[PDB]
């Protein structure tokens, strides 16, 4: 029943709030490493990970 693909998708949103997406040039309010980000808790980052997940908002995919 554990959806690994879904859990990691949520973890990419969670990573997006906690650590960001690495790039300096990101203008996403729902994302760290962006000027528009306010420092939230990891509990709040996981809550907002689920919010952005279910609505399928602007996710920053890791593309080297
Ligand atoms: Zn970003």
UniProtKB/TrEMBL annotation:
Protein origin, superkingdom: Eukaryota
Region forming the signal peptide: none
Location of the protein in the cell: Cytoplasm; Nucleus
Annotated function: E3 ubiquitin-protein ligase which accepts ubiquitin from an E2 ubiquitin-conjugating enzyme in the form of a thioester and transfers it to its substrates.
Official protein name in the record: Ubiquitin-protein ligase E3A
Gene: UBE3A
């Amino acid at each position: 029943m554990k959806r690994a693909a879904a859990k990691h998708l949520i973890e990419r949103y969670y990573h997006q709030l906690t650590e960001g997406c690495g790039n300096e040039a990101c203008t996403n309010e729902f994302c760290a490493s962006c000027p528009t980000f306010l420092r939230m808790d990891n509990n709040a980052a996981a809550i907002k990970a689920l919010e952005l997940y279910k609505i399928n908002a602007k996710l920053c995919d890791p593309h080297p």
